[PDB]
Amino acid sequence: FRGVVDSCCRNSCSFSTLRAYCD
Amino acid sequence: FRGVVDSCCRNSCSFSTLRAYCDS
Amino acid sequence: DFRGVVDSCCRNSCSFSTLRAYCD
Amino acid sequence: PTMRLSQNVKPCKSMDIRNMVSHFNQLENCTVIEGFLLIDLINDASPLNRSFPKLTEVTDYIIIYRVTGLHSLSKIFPNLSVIRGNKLFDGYALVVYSNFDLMDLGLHKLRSITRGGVRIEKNHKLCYDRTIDWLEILAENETQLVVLTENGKEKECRLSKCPGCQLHNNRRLCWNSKLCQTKCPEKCRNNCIDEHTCCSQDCLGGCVIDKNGNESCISCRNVSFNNICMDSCPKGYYQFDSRCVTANECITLTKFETNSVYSGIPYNGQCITHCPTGYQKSENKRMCEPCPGGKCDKECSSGLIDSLERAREFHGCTIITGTEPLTISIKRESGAHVMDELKYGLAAVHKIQSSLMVHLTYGLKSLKFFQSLTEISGDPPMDADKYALYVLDNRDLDELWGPNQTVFIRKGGVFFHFNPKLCVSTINQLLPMLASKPKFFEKSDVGADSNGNRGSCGTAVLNVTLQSVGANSAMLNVTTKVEIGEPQKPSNATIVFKDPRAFIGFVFYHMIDPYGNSTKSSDDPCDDRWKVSSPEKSGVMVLSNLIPYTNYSYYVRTMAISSELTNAESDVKNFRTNPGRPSKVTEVVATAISDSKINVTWSYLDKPYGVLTRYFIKAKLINRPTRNNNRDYCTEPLVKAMENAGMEFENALQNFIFVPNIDDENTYKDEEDLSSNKQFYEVFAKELPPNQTHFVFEKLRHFTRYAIFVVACREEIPSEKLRDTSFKKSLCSDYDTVFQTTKRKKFADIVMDLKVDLEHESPVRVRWTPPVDPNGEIVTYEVAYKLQKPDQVEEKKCIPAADFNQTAGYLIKLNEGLYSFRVRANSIAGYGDFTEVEHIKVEPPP
Amino acid sequence: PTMRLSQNVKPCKSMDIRNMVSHFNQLENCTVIEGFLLIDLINDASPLNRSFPKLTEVTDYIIIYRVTGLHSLSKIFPNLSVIRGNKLFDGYALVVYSNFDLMDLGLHKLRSITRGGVRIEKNHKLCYDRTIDWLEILAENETQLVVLTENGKEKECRLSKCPGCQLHNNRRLCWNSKLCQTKCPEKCRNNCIDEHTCCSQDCLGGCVIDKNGNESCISCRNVSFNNICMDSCPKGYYQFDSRCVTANECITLTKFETNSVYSGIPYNGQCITHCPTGYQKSENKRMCEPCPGGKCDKECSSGLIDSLERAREFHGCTIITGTEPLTISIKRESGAHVMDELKYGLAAVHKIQSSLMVHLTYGLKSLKFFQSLTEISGDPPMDADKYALYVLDNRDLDELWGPNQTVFIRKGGVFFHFNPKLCVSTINQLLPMLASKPKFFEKSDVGADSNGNRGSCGTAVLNVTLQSVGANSAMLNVTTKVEIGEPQKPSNATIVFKDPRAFIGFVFYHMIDPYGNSTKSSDDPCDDRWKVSSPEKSGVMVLSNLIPYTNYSYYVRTMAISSELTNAESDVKNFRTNPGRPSKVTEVVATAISDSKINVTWSYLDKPYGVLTRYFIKAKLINRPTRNNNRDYCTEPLVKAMENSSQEYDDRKVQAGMEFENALQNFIFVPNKDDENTYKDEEDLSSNKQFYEVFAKELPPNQTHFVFEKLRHFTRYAIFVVACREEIPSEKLRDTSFKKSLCSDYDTVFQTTKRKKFADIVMDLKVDLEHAESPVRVRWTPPVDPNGEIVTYEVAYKLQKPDQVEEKKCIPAADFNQTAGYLIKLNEGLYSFRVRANSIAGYGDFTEVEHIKVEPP
Amino acid sequence: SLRACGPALMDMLRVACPNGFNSMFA
Amino acid sequence: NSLRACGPALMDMLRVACPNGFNSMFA
Amino acid sequence: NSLRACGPALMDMLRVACPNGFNS
Numbered sequence A: 001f002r003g004v005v006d007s008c009c010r011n012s013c014s015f016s017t018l019r020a021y022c023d
Numbered sequence B: 001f002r003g004v005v006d007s008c009c010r011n012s013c014s015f016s017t018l019r020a021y022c023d024s
Numbered sequence C: 001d002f003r004g005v006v007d008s009c010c011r012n013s014c015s016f017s018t019l020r021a022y023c024d
Numbered sequence D: 001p002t003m004r005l006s007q008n009v010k011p012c013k014s015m016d017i018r019n020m021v022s023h024f025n026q027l028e029n030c031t032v033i034e035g036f037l038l039i040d041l042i043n044d045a046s047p048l049n050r051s052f053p054k055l056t057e058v059t060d061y062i063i064i065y066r067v068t069g070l071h072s073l074s075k076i077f078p079n080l081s082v083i084r085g086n087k088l089f090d091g092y093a094l095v096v097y098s099n100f101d102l103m104d105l106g107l108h109k110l111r112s113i114t115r116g117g118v119r120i121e122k123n124h125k126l127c128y129d130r131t132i133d134w135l136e137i138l139a140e141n142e143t144q145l146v147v148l149t150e151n152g153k154e155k156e157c158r159l160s161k162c163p164g165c166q167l168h169n170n171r172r173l174c175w176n177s178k179l180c181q182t183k184c185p186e187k188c189r190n191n192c193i194d195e196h197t198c199c200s201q202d203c204l205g206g207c208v209i210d211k212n213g214n215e216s217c218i219s220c221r222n223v224s225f226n227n228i229c230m231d232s233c234p235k236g237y238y239q240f241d242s243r244c245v246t247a248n249e250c251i252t253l254t255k256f257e258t259n260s261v262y263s264g265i266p267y268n269g270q271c272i273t274h275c276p277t278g279y280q281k282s283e284n285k286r287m288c289e290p291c292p293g294g295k296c297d298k299e300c301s302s303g304l305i306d307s308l309e310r311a312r313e314f315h316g317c318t319i320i321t322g323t324e325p326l327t328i329s330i331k332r333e334s335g336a337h338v339m340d341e342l343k344y345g346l347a348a349v350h351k352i353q354s355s356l357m358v359h360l361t362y363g364l365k366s367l368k369f370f371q372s373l374t375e376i377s378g379d380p381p382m383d384a385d386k387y388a389l390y391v392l393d394n395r396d397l398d399e400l401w402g403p404n405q406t407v408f409i410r411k412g413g414v415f416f417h418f419n420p421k422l423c424v425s426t427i428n429q430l431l432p433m434l435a436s437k438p439k440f441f442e443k444s445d446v447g448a449d450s451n452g453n454r455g456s457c458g459t460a461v462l463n464v465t466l467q468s469v470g471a472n473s474a475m476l477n478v479t480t481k482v483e484i485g486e487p488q489k490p491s492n493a494t495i496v497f498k499d500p501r502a503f504i505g506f507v508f509y510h511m512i513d514p515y516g517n518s519t520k521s522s523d524d525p526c527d528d529r530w531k532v533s534s535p536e537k538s539g540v541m542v543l544s545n546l547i548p549y550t551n552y553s554y555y556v557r558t559m560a561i562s563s564e565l566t567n568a569e570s571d572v573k574n575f576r577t578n579p580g581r582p583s584k585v586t587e588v589v590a591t592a593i594s595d596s597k598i599n600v601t602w603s604y605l606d607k608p609y610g611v612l613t614r615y616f617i618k619a620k621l622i623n624r625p626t627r628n629n630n631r632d633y634c635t636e637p638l639v640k641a642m643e644n645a646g647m648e649f650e651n652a653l654q655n656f657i658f659v660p661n662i663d664d665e666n667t668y669k670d671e672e673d674l675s676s677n678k679q680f681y682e683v684f685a686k687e688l689p690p691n692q693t694h695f696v697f698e699k700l701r702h703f704t705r706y707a708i709f710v711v712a713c714r715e716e717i718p719s720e721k722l723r724d725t726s727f728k729k730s731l732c733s734d735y736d737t738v739f740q741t742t743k744r745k746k747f748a749d750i751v752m753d754l755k756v757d758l759e760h761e762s763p764v765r766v767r768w769t770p771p772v773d774p775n776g777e778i779v780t781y782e783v784a785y786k787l788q789k790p791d792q793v794e795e796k797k798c799i800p801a802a803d804f805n806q807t808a809g810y811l812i813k814l815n816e817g818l819y820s821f822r823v824r825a826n827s828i829a830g831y832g833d834f835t836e837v838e839h840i841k842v843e844p845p846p
Numbered sequence E: 001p002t003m004r005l006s007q008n009v010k011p012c013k014s015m016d017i018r019n020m021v022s023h024f025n026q027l028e029n030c031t032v033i034e035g036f037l038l039i040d041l042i043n044d045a046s047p048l049n050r051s052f053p054k055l056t057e058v059t060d061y062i063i064i065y066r067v068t069g070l071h072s073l074s075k076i077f078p079n080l081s082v083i084r085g086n087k088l089f090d091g092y093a094l095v096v097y098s099n100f101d102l103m104d105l106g107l108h109k110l111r112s113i114t115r116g117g118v119r120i121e122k123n124h125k126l127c128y129d130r131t132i133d134w135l136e137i138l139a140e141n142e143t144q145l146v147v148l149t150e151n152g153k154e155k156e157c158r159l160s161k162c163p164g165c166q167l168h169n170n171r172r173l174c175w176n177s178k179l180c181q182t183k184c185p186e187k188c189r190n191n192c193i194d195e196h197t198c199c200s201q202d203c204l205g206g207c208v209i210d211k212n213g214n215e216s217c218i219s220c221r222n223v224s225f226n227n228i229c230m231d232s233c234p235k236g237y238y239q240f241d242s243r244c245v246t247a248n249e250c251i252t253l254t255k256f257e258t259n260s261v262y263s264g265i266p267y268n269g270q271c272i273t274h275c276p277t278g279y280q281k282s283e284n285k286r287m288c289e290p291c292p293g294g295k296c297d298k299e300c301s302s303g304l305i306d307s308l309e310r311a312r313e314f315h316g317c318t319i320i321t322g323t324e325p326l327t328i329s330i331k332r333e334s335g336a337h338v339m340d341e342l343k344y345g346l347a348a349v350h351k352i353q354s355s356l357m358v359h360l361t362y363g364l365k366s367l368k369f370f371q372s373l374t375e376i377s378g379d380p381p382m383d384a385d386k387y388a389l390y391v392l393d394n395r396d397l398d399e400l401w402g403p404n405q406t407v408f409i410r411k412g413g414v415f416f417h418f419n420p421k422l423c424v425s426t427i428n429q430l431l432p433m434l435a436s437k438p439k440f441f442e443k444s445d446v447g448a449d450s451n452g453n454r455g456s457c458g459t460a461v462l463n464v465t466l467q468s469v470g471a472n473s474a475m476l477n478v479t480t481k482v483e484i485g486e487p488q489k490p491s492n493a494t495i496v497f498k499d500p501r502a503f504i505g506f507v508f509y510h511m512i513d514p515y516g517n518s519t520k521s522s523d524d525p526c527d528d529r530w531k532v533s534s535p536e537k538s539g540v541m542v543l544s545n546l547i548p549y550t551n552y553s554y555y556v557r558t559m560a561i562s563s564e565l566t567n568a569e570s571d572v573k574n575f576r577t578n579p580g581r582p583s584k585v586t587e588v589v590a591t592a593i594s595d596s597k598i599n600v601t602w603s604y605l606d607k608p609y610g611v612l613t614r615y616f617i618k619a620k621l622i623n624r625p626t627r628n629n630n631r632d633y634c635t636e637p638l639v640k641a642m643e644n645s646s647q648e649y650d651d652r653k654v655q656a657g658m659e660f661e662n663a664l665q666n667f668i669f670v671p672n673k674d675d676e677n678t679y680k681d682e683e684d685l686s687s688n689k690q691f692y693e694v695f696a697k698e699l700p701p702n703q704t705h706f707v708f709e710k711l712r713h714f715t716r717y718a719i720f721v722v723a724c725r726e727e728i729p730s731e732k733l734r735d736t737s738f739k740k741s742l743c744s745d746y747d748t749v750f751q752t753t754k755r756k757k758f759a760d761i762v763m764d765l766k767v768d769l770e771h772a773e774s775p776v777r778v779r780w781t782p783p784v785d786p787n788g789e790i791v792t793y794e795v796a797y798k799l800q801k802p803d804q805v806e807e808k809k810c811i812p813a814a815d816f817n818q819t820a821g822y823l824i825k826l827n828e829g830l831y832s833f834r835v836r837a838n839s840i841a842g843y844g845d846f847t848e849v850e851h852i853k854v855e856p857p
Numbered sequence F: 001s002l003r004a005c006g007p008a009l010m011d012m013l014r015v016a017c018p019n020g021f022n023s024m025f026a
Numbered sequence G: 001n002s003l004r005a006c007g008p009a010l011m012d013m014l015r016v017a018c019p020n021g022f023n024s025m026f027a
Numbered sequence H: 001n002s003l004r005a006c007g008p009a010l011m012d013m014l015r016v017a018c019p020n021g022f023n024s
């Protein structure tokens, strides 16, 4: 895992932001 | 028009007319 | 007096479309 | 092929038993009733006798109204088998209403009711009303017409055991305790003489069978002639309900209807009361002839239609006239036959000279039954001559005039209000029908949201597909693509919104639904079942914080600015999450059984979040208790020890800052780590099947505390079996340790090998060998002695273990005498046990 | 005399930096701020590579909210000298809130905060927040408003050593590890450079001293003009915070102070933002003037109100103007708070120039929120001057203007349709309202059938009376006789139903209300406060499972089918249940005080029912424990330390049954253990007169603890505690011998007193010998009042010689019935003797020593 | 003068003429 | 669809609501 | 709407959110 751990824990993240991490 | 519930109930009726459905 | 976001989303529930109004 | 019926039929016309018992004689040995049979207003029916088994079926219907003094209906109709319901009373074929003394329906012989249904209402003592499967008796195509209410079933009628036939179909279906319902196999439903003996399809309601093999039908399938059942009447004879008759017989027979008398007329092989469409009765009343001008223009006065029964009167009416508006206020308990009775009644009308009004209707589906209507002259309009079509408070009206039917309205305007299932678009169809041809309704004549707010308005359907599912989250996918403005190729999917501003986005709903049958969210002010989500224009959403291994129901709908009436929704799909992590095992209790056996018990009183294929018990030795240095032994001995708002400033700041724009058992295996000396287990663990709620170890070390696991593990889904290659998994539950201690070994093995001696006034010496494996470390040795003198008391001394063996034994100074000696070791576990006695003598001479 | 300030001034108005660092350009070479300066929501301040030394003073507060990537605050303000704080935020003049990267302030040159407090919190890396005594920064008066919290003060701030630098209160005065903080001597009070180098009082916050020897202020204390300080502005100019300006400048010197900016008005020497109370501002803003009408009212433009967030823009409006009509079209069924927001935006409205329209509203309960409307002038009316009040298609509009509340429509008619909840009689309240004064409304204006279709109209009043009230049940009695059928044919009976079948029955509401002021209904989607009984046609109801001695509220309404308009409901009433039985006393704890006393302590945390008329205490002496015969002693002696959905219901069933009945009747006929009774004062001394066998007392309701006396030594007492309540006048004549229940249940508590101080003691012991060859003998008396049975007697003896240690013998209680004596054989010599008893309470005390001489041949 | 309905109508009619009803078909 | 939140929770909800800049205060 | 998860919950969230692979 990468900074996703903090881009979606320390602050909420939207659907598109999360989807952006897919290959 | 001849029915009881259209002679009495709506339009109201009177005892004189009521004693026609039963007299024998 | 004045009212704003906090009384619009904290003192009572609010729809997500409201928060969208505070974005440039 | 051909089959006689039982007994020659003695038909007799419609019969009514009135005001007292002896009128029952009119019904004596009538085989079949050519019309309706009714019993009413018998102040005291108890004096009845002579039940009438010869009667078998009635063509039209049965109504029993306010007959008092009657216990069970079977005492009048022993062998009533079938009710044909040719003509029907307000959609009902059997009525048993407002009767106090009827506590047993009793119709055991009844098999089939051909049309309509049955109402059994306000019969207080009539227990066992709901203990019959009417739906097998009734016609299968539409069985909705059953009503059982107000039959004193609150507490008094709870003798439901009945002969239990006994418990079939989750009911002891019965006509009271005496008889149970006689079912028929689906191959011959309501056409069986017993549970297995199906009758011939040429019969109806079973047949009589005798040793001679001369089977005979109880009632014919279609018709009868010379007591022979056949599919159709022979040439030269006219069908009259259930039998064929001659011309004169038909001309003399009669049916009583609409409180009026109709004499049958033979026509086209049938005896009919009214000439069919386009025909009229002959002046001599013996035949039907074509109407002059193609059809007869009979006109009928307007009025009110409070029930399907009243609507029957309008049969054959072509023109409705009279200043009174023709009001339809049918109130059915969701019945079905309304569309049939009304179609029979009013369908012939081609124009209403007066105004129409549909008010307070319940169960009326549509006005399509005005099949021939073409104009509403509205000469006198209703409500101050303002309106000619008045539609108010119709709880079930859902569609207006039939497909491309036209009705010209000449005077006045429409008025639609409070029709929960009639969407506005349907109302708009009337625009080209008005004489004024308005492009829009005056805003006082059509409510905008009071119409169609409950019923599903005109809307397309969205294909919604599930992309993936996990432990706590799932992703949806709306397949039906939306488009904005011109599509450039319509009919390749749909849902086209003219303006980009119009479409706000898809909205997803979901909520827990173990049974998978939850209903959609209504417009109720506080229906909070569904967890509505925020709009998403991309058509994809990730439901989150789901409960693992649970069923869910979800559906979609398009949200747009209220000006745009285009709308669509999906069906209520369903799905279930993945297993996830099982919950901790509850109620783990550990009890010591002996010095070397611990006994663990538990129970799974929580959701397993999957299928738990196996438990896992593990016990590992915690290091033995130890003597702390500051222990005050031999001065403070112990016998036993086994008990082991401030934020408001932040709000005021936010209000101003924003401004709107303008132990780590990852993996396990069965293991048994025997001690170094091979006498006890250091750690023990074993996999168990889900059977066990308890397990007992053995060969456990005496007086030692063991920490106990209890872990439940779930089965592995194929995806998790490989997809989660090297991380997490987490397929086994969490746990919390439980501690228990083995008791203090045997009742012996404390000290041994004792002896006493002296130097040669010599002091006394006592020797012993310390225990090899006592209940914890020895804290003290207690030495006791007693003189060989009667009634003596034993003295004793204490040493804190000490270097007792330095001199090969403890030293004692004692006076003259003969003494017995005892010794015991004492450990942290508690008081020990003394050894056997030994003796020594003191004898200093002068 | 007077001196120029530091450098030429170039003010810039109130500013705000947000969403990116590049916005910092707005501060380029600003000398001062004519308003607040707030920086916030910069998600990363690291890329910044400039400072703004020329910024020296800020007229209003600074707030630094949620700026991240900024560690040293000084990076932005190299020389922020004075925080004039002319206007405060929430009473504060400096806020540094939740800066998750801030570590240091570093405002070395800051020297004064002329007003307001300082709040600094949630800066989870901020050290040195506590290392400056703020009260020497704040004004020279009481401004104890500082608040410092959650600034990561736990342990990590090891660099608090600071260069030492001045030290006071056992801590250095330092901004950070290298920026020490310096005070001024009391001779200046914050216009000084160091501990002695202080400048003219005319300067505030500091000064610059040139090599020429001249002195220049970095900020003027009172005012400035043409870069020159002085006490007051020259005439022909107007003061604006720091600098005097010309009127043509004041007219453009706006200040924000709220979501809408206010312009500056040159007024008698001061550039005030808005005129004082009772003064209007000229259309040219060249001056204020007294209100032409005495009162001043804010005009506003008409426009559609599509949602609550759009209504809040109307706050403070008093006159609505413009040809467009005020269209209230809030489709969002926001529920309860809808009234709150609509009232906030419009409560102050007084006059509407162009009529009002309410359309397609969902949750709008009533138009009460026009709390101050008095005139709908309707100069331009709706729809070609036809209408001036346009209420159409509202699902929940129930009331027009509140009580009284005249509105005096001047022009045009009105329009009402499709308002199902609005009873027509309510609309008729407007008949005396219209200026035209019509006697009635035409069907074209108010729908006869489209209004009140579902509203409670023409409600009558029902008399509800409660027959009886119990401990946990009560009965109601709807007194108002209701003629379910038509009288046939007497008069009277105000409330009547034309059809028996149309009246399902009364329905009874009730709920717990400690204040008796609960209302029948409240503005809520579905308030589940009221418990609803099932429809009840009889007219009498019995509530059950009521919590005793609690105040309730209840009211009754009729439940008629949808198509029947006759209905009624009673006013809300109150009643209180009976006192019932009080709850158990709590945490009864009893402790021994001696061999003769016990202290009993308790409280009454659990709620009572009724009033605590009396506490009750009782003590029953439990029979003393005694030896079990199978036990042994002298082999196991005792030390013995002692123990102890809303969804309006469907009437489809009733309607359908009704119509079927009508049709059928039309067709059928044709023409031609301590029961509380013992709870009373009671005392019973034993026959020995030494101790109480049974002891009880009645106590006032405020003695939470009691102490006993004359108790038996070493015995277990069955303590007993109870609460009681007074009896209602009806109770004392309804009960004869069976109800009672005036007192609570009890939790028996056992205590054991203590052993007698001197314990078991033997007395009158003596040695003896036969015929003075026979063994010597000893005789004594058992203790008079031992602590239970003397299970064993113990005698100790020793030779009067050095070598022999003390010897002892033990005998059970037996063998002393013969002469209460014991024997032993001894050799020639003289001995000493001692004796004691041992009982089930423990070892006894030793008696005084005896002596004896022995001399057989 | 009379206005009864449903069971009220039934009972009032029964009381007003308990001497039996004329009935039909005869 | 009811974001009842206060203080830092509300700030986080705003941040997740829109990644752009927040407010045009006289700009 | 909004999302918030951590640890294995976040791992599952990302697993569902990316039916295709996601790099280390």
Ligand SMILES: *[C@@H]1O[C@H](CO)[C@@H](O)[C@H](O)[C@H]1NC(C)=O
Residues within 6 Å of the ligand: D021, D022, D047, D048, D049, D050
């Ligand atoms: C049956 O009742 C009739 C009168 O209704 C009577 O004449 C006859 O005798 C009775 N028969 C029997 C067997 O009770």
Ligand SMILES: *[C@@H]1O[C@H](CO)[C@@H](O)[C@H](O)[C@H]1NC(C)=O
Residues within 6 Å of the ligand: D028, D029
């Ligand atoms: C049938 O009933 C009639 C009365 O209408 C009677 O005269 C006749 O005897 C009866 N016949 C049989 C077989 O019951």
Ligand SMILES: *[C@@H]1O[C@H](CO)[C@@H](O)[C@H](O)[C@H]1NC(C)=O
Residues within 6 Å of the ligand: D403, D404
């Ligand atoms: C009217 O509708 C019927 C369907 O019942 C259809 O067959 C017919 O073609 C339609 N005609 C017109 C003119 O719309």
Ligand SMILES: *[C@@H]1O[C@H](CO)[C@@H](O)[C@H](O)[C@H]1NC(C)=O
Residues within 6 Å of the ligand: D467, D477, D479, D540
């Ligand atoms: C399912 O969603 C994906 C995006 O996650 C999209 O590419 C795909 O088209 C959707 N399904 C279909 C059938 O289009």
Ligand SMILES: *[C@@H]1O[C@H](CO)[C@@H](O)[C@H](O)[C@H]1NC(C)=O
Residues within 6 Å of the ligand: D461, D462, D463, D479, D480, D493, D494
């Ligand atoms: C939905 O999918 C089915 C195939 O599964 C297809 O036949 C149908 O046309 C689709 N409908 C829409 C509205 O996309």
Ligand SMILES: *[C@@H]1O[C@H](CO)[C@@H](O)[C@H](O)[C@H]1NC(C)=O
Residues within 6 Å of the ligand: D514, D515, D517, D518
């Ligand atoms: C729906 O499921 C519930 C249980 O969840 C059950 O009680 C109810 O009878 C079901 N109804 C239908 C129509 O399936």
Ligand SMILES: *[C@@H]1O[C@H](CO)[C@@H](O)[C@H](O)[C@H]1NC(C)=O
Residues within 6 Å of the ligand: D591, D599, D600, D601, D694, D696
């Ligand atoms: C102890 O073991 C026995 C035999 O396996 C079992 O019956 C019992 O339940 C166990 N103890 C407890 C507390 O369950």
Ligand SMILES: *[C@@H]1O[C@H](CO)[C@@H](O)[C@H](O)[C@H]1NC(C)=O
Residues within 6 Å of the ligand: D689, D690, D691
């Ligand atoms: C124990 O579990 C096995 C499955 O492993 C099952 O076949 C068996 O019936 C179970 N026995 C009991 C007594 O639960």
Ligand SMILES: *[C@@H]1O[C@H](CO)[C@@H](O)[C@H](O)[C@H]1NC(C)=O
Residues within 6 Å of the ligand: E021, E022, E047, E048, E049, E050
């Ligand atoms: C850095 O400073 C230069 C001036 O040297 C300026 O032009 C630039 O905008 C600054 N950039 C940032 C990110 O502060």
Ligand SMILES: *[C@@H]1O[C@H](CO)[C@@H](O)[C@H](O)[C@H]1NC(C)=O
Residues within 6 Å of the ligand: E467, E477, E479, E540
């Ligand atoms: C109170 O109820 C009783 C029946 O319990 C009834 O007789 C009485 O009339 C009611 N009260 C009044 C004032 O009628």
Ligand SMILES: *[C@@H]1O[C@H](CO)[C@@H](O)[C@H](O)[C@H]1NC(C)=O
Residues within 6 Å of the ligand: E461, E462, E463, E479, E480, E481, E494
């Ligand atoms: C209610 O009771 C009062 C007296 O308590 C009486 O004056 C009034 O007429 C009653 N009204 C009704 C509607 O019962």
Ligand SMILES: *[C@@H]1O[C@H](CO)[C@@H](O)[C@H](O)[C@H]1NC(C)=O
Residues within 6 Å of the ligand: E515, E517, E518, E519
């Ligand atoms: C009732 O009165 C109490 C104070 O006794 C008060 O707190 C409460 O708000 C009041 N309720 C209403 C509805 O007025």
Ligand SMILES: *[C@@H]1O[C@H](CO)[C@@H](O)[C@H](O)[C@H]1NC(C)=O
Residues within 6 Å of the ligand: E514, E515, E516, E551, E574, E575, E576
């Ligand atoms: C409770 O009701 C009684 C009368 O039943 C009344 O005296 C008392 O004031 C009420 N309590 C309150 C708090 O209103």
Ligand SMILES: *[C@@H]1O[C@H](CO)[C@@H](O)[C@H](O)[C@H]1NC(C)=O
Residues within 6 Å of the ligand: E599, E601, E705, E706, E707
């Ligand atoms: C014992 O009772 C006395 C009252 O005589 C009281 O003053 C004292 O506090 C009590 N002590 C305890 C420990 O309850």
